[PDB]
Amino acid sequence: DRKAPVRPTPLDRVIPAPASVDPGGAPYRITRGTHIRVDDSREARRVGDYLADLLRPATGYRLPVTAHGHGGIRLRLAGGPYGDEGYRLDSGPAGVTITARKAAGLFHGVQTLRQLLPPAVEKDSAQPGPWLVAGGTIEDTPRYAWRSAMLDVSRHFFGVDEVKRYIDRVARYKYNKLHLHLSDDQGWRIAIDSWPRLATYGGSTEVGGGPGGYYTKAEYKEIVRYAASRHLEVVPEIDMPGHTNAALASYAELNCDGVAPPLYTGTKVGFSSLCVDKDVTYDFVDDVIGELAALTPGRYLHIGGDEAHSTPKADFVAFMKRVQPIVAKYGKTVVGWHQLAGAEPVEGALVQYWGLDRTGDAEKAEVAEAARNGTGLILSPADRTYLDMKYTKDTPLGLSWAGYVEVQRSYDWDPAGYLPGAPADAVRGVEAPLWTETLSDPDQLDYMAFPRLPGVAELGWSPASTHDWDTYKVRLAAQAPYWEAAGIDFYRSPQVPWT
């Protein structure tokens, strides 16, 4: 009865593990007449409609969303110790009630509810159910405020609809930030009016050659809007001064030798660099960041700074000293890969650490020192949360430069004590980056994203006290029938006792 269990799934069997789970009494059962009661506000109804849309196909129920009556499923905004993202979920014969201070909390409560319901809820045609929700109470709040997933649309381009699909994948686990790697050596994916060729030429191809692609301003705004409706703050990234071949290949003048390199379709890194000794370079950067910031309602702007191996140390430091201020100039907070920690991060900046267990002490110290100086840390170790890394030597897709990363390794660590000497309070959260040198379609993205994606979300959300591989793998194993019913391909790791 994998698809439709006789009894409801345990109240604590959800990912991320809830802060507090108190099971008790009989469960709630959704029946044909169940109404979704929300507050009389736009944001409230919005979450109600989102929930109704998720349940209608599989249940075949009307599930009307209204601001009157005593609906069996109630989403209510009220005071409480839940912060901006927490919530309380009460379930019993009298109905299911999700309480929170803000819509995001209600949205998160919904993500938990869809896991309490049976796997059949993932189907697109009416199913028998039963639509049971274990009885009891759940009180849940996040451990970290930065819980993101990155999608590389530069190596291989993915259109608006494919991005919306990935957004839906991550929304399941309460991620609250979507980092978009909009430019690299193989492509420039965002239209910049002041520099037209970046998109028309720099976005004309991708890894492996052939058609590339890019988002017009309108398409990008639609991605931001859709992400916002899924409570994901979009963090755009324009990598610099390295990983800039797409831009350099579009405008000869940006190159040190004034010659435009060919468009790049390979899968290597570290060979490109903006010309630090040219003034036009900083006019370019200012134009790009200014236009990007205007399309960014979010608080952050990622300027990369990784693998600038064709940029001498002194030039890198000089380049960053000059460009970081451009971000604040356009009202945003700067974010960069941890290489930025070696180039004096400006006040309020955050750095994304992608080091590994084997990384040298000097490099780790430089990052820990930045944390000591007030720089926020986003943890995404290459040998832990890089979703493009192979599970084993036999994985058909992905890379292996950071070694192999099975499910347990990806999950089995604590962000608070991860980086030696780094102040725990400097850790803002975690991120799961999905690079695409080897991925060209949505299904390949799923196979490499799952089943590690949920684990990273837990590290960012759940209390350290709930962290435990032996019990976590049981909760992960339970997702199998849900992913199968949803058509989500995933690596069936031998470390997980799949249900």
The string over 331-352, giving b where at least 16 C-beta atoms fall within 10 Å of a residue's C-beta and e elsewhere, is: ebbbbbbbbbbbbebbeebbbb
- Asked if 487 is part of the footprint of Cl ion (rule: CB under 5 A), the reply reads no
Cβ-closest position to Cl ion: 266
**What is the nearest approach in angstroms of Cl ion to the Cβ of residue 209?**
12
Closer residue to Cl ion, CB minimum distance, 238 or 335:
238
Stretch that binds Cl ion, among 34-42, 215-223, 250-258, 284-292 (CB under 5 A): 215-223
Record the tokens describing residue 78, joined without a space.
Answer: 């009220």
**Which of 216, 373, 400, 471: binder of Cl ion (CB under 5 A)?**
216
**What is the nearest approach in angstroms of Cl ion to the Cβ of residue 168?**
4
**What is the nearest approach in angstroms of Cl ion to the Cβ of residue 215?**
9
**Which of 53, 124, 168, 443: binder of Cl ion (CB under 5 A)?**
168
- Asked if 70 is part of the footprint of Cl ion (rule: CB under 5 A), the reply reads no
Stretch that binds Cl ion, among 54-62, 163-171, 377-385, 426-434 (CB under 5 A): 163-171
**What is the nearest approach in angstroms of Cl ion to the Cβ of residue 190?**
11
Stretch that binds Cl ion, among 31-39, 45-53, 213-221, 427-435 (CB under 5 A): 213-221
Residue located via tokens 């650490």? 353
Stretch that binds Cl ion, among 151-159, 169-177, 179-187, 459-467 (CB under 5 A): 169-177
Closer residue to Cl ion, CB minimum distance, 135 or 241:
241
**Which of 29, 46, 56, 217: binder of Cl ion (CB under 5 A)?**
217
**What is the nearest approach in angstroms of Cl ion to the Cβ of residue 428?**
26
Closer residue to Cl ion, CB minimum distance, 160 or 228:
160
Using CB under 5 A, count the residues that bind Cl ion.
Answer: 8
Range 124-128 contact pairs with CB under 8 angstroms and sequence separation of 24 or more = 124/57, 124/58, 125/57, 125/58, 125/60, 126/57, 126/58, 126/59, 126/60, 127/4, 127/58, 127/59, 127/60, 128/4
**Which of 69, 128, 266, 494: binder of Cl ion (CB under 5 A)?**
266
- Asked if 464 is part of the footprint of Cl ion (rule: CB under 5 A), the reply reads no
Q: How far does Cα 20 stand from its chain's mean position?
A: 24
Query: Residue by residue, what is the 3-state secondary structure of 145-184?
Result: CEEEEEEECCCCCCCHHHHHHHHHHHHCCCCCEEEEEEEC
**What is the nearest approach in angstroms of Cl ion to the Cβ of residue 489?**
12
Closer residue to Cl ion, CB minimum distance, 218 or 280:
218
Closer residue to Cl ion, CB minimum distance, 216 or 471:
216
- Asked if 218 is part of the footprint of Cl ion (rule: CB under 5 A), the reply reads yes
Stretch that binds Cl ion, among 9-17, 139-147, 216-224, 289-297 (CB under 5 A): 216-224
**What is the nearest approach in angstroms of Cl ion to the Cβ of residue 106?**
19
What amino acid positions are annotated as catalytic residues?
A: 307
**Which residues sit in the known binding site for N-acetyl-D-glucosamine?**
155, 306-307, 386, 388, 401, 437
Closer residue to Cl ion, CB minimum distance, 126 or 218:
218
- Asked if 268 is part of the footprint of Cl ion (rule: CB under 5 A), the reply reads yes
* Interacting residue ranges for Cl ion, rule: CB under 5 A: 168-169, 216-218, 266, 268-269
